[PDB]
Amino acid sequence: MKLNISFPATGCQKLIEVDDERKLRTFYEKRMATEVAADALGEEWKGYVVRISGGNDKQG
């Protein structure tokens, strides 16, 4: 799956592609509007907190 990351501070968005499920295990079985630590998604992400805000199914 892809991700759409948004920084509401400077007003900047970016799409990201991540394939390895290990990075994605952070978000699985977690309803919308819950904050998590995104430091599992890479090493540029170390002290980062992200809030899930929604998404789209396959078939949109």
The contacts of residue 58 (CB under 8 Å, 6+ apart) are none
Q: Can residue 8 be called a binding residue for RNA (CB under 7 A)?
A: no
Residue 60 in the binding site for RNA (CB under 7 A): yes
Task: Tell me the two tokens of residue 47.
Answer: 């002290």
Structure tokens at 34: 């819950």
* 42 part of the interface to RNA, by CB under 7 A: no
Judge contact between 30 and 52, C-beta under 8 A: yes
Binding of RNA at residue 31 (CB under 7 A)?
A: yes
Q: Is 9 in the site for RNA (CB under 7 A)?
A: no
Residues at the site binding RNA, with contacts judged by CB under 7 A: 2, 4, 13-15, 31-34, 56-60
